[PDB]
Design a protein around this ligand. Structure first.
Ligand SMILES: CCCCCCCCCCCCCCCCCC(=O)OC[C@H](COP(=O)([O-])OCC(O)COP(=O)([O-])OC[C@@H](COC(=O)CCCCCCCCCCCCCCCCC)OC(=O)CCCCCCCCCCCCCCCCC)OC(=O)CCCCCCCCCCCCCCCCC
Ligand SMILES: CCCCCCCCCCCCCCCCC[C@@H](O)O[C@H](CO[C@H](O)CCCCCCCCCCCCCCC)COP(=O)(O)OCC[N+](C)(C)C
Lengths: 122, 175
């Protein structure tokens, strides 16, 4: 029920191991970052609407801070997420390699020699 | 005219008789034909002449697309998606060409039934037999596949038929 908590050589509260730096960072126009910025913009607009201020005009410094905070946090969130998926794939490939008797390569047939069952539609 | 191939769309030599009048009365059909000719067929012909004069000035062509022959679904291994994709596209194009072959044969049959008049039951037997052969072949290849058909289902149908035929011939050889 806890697959990656017990992995060896894992620092308790890093959020970003040093090994993560071997991975390409997300581009600054990453559509997920753009969506995080859009979330910040919606937060700014709802903020204006709740306090009965003009919705698109009232606080531009405030809306800018909303957008910037969301983009800033989202960048690091994306880094950590991509790093965790890289760990998953690394471990899966290493395990398949070290246990070849569990992942055998069997000879595959062309469809000319596989007998498939035919079911007429009528 | 020469636009279409007369081997794919054949027709008999078109025997027509000569007029043999038997009366002094004037034939109103021929007079009406002269009137129609000189009121309709000549202005239309002149208009077409001008149109084709304007066409000849600017002459450009288009080319029929030719498709290579890629490996079919029998020589694709079970989970190879690219071989399967190209084989399935090829099988679909062949299915379309076979539909058009049956269409050509049906056009021949219809033209014969109309042309032969009262003698169509004897004079169109070859057209009928040709259609029967083509229809039998097309039916074996594609009937009962259903919607969501594919090259794999066509292959399974062929293999089932081949198994039945082989077993029938084998038990006929024991007879
Ligand atoms: C999937 C495809 C994409 C989808 C996109 C995502 C979804 C949309 C985004 C969601 C968040 C954005 C908006 C949130 C803040 C809105 C709050 C608000 O009150 O709005 C009022 C405000 C207007 O008020 P006002 O101008 O001050 O004057 C009005 C009067 O004072 C009179 O005003 P009033 O306050 O007195 O009136 C009160 C009114 C106030 O009622 C509301 O305003 C409802 C707002 C609820 C917010 C929704 C929560 C968060 C969003 C979730 C969306 C869920 C989507 C999934 C499906 C669920 C459907 C909801 O309530 C009522 O009258 C009762 C009616 C009850 C009917 C039931 C409907 C309620 C729920 C409907 C929700 C529908 C979705 C949101 C639609 C857009 C709303 C602006 O809205 C705006 O004018 C701004 C809207 C957006 C403008 C910014 C556009 C960007 C800049 C333009 C350039 C384009 C950029 C691209 C550049 C291109 C190159 C050139
Ligand atoms: C509705 C959306 C949910 C919102 C959630 C709140 C978001 C704001 C919270 C503030 C962010 C800061 C939190 C972490 C900063 C540094 C702390 C860091 O070191 O924590 C590490 C861990 O990092 C954090 O866990 C990651 C937090 C990210 C949460 C967001 C993911 C939401 C899921 C998808 C929704 C998208 C949300 C969009 C963002 C606004 C420690 O790792 P570890 O001690 O070994 O694990 C403890 C738990 N174990 C052992 C049981 C595994």
């Amino acid at each position: 029920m806890t697959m990656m908590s017990g992995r060896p050589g894992r620092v308790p509260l890093q959020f970003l191991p040093n090994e993560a730096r071997s991975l390409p960072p997300p581009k600054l126009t990453d559509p997920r970052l753009v969506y995080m910025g859009f979330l910040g913009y919606c937060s700014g607009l709802i903020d204006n609407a709740i306090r009965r201020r003009p919705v698109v005009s009232a606080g531009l410094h405030r809306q800018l801070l909303y957008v910037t905070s969301f983009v800033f946090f989202g960048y690091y969130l994306l880094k950590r997420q991509d790093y965790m998926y890289a760990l998953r794939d690394h471990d899966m490939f290493a395990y398949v390699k070290s246990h070849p008797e569990d992942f055998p390569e069997k000879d595959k047939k062309t469809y000319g020699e596989i007998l498939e069952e035919f079911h007429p539609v009528r | 005219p020469d636009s279409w191939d007369k081997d794919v769309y054949p027709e008999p030599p078109r025997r027509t008789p000569a007029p043999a009048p038997q009366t002094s009365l004037p034939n109103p059909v021929t007079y009406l034909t002269k009137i129609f000719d000189l009121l309709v067929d000549r202005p239309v012909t002149l208009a077409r002449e001008f149109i084709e004069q304007q066409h000849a000035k600017n002459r450009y062509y288009y080319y029929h697309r030719e498709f290579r022959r890629v490996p079919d679904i029998t020589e694709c291994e079970e989970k190879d998606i690219l071989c399967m994709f190209e084989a399935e596209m090829q099988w679909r194009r062949d299915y379309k060409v076979d539909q058009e072959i049956v269409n050509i044969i049906q056009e021949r049959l219809k033209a014969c039934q109309q042309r032969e008049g009262e003698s169509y039951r004897q004079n169109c037997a070859k057209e009928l037999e040709q259609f029967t052969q083509v229809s039998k072949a097309f039916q074996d290849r594609y009937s009962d596949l259903g919607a969501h058909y594919s090259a794999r289902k066509c292959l399974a149908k062929q293999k089932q038929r081949m198994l039945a035929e082989r077993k029938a011939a084998k038990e006929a050889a024991a007879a």
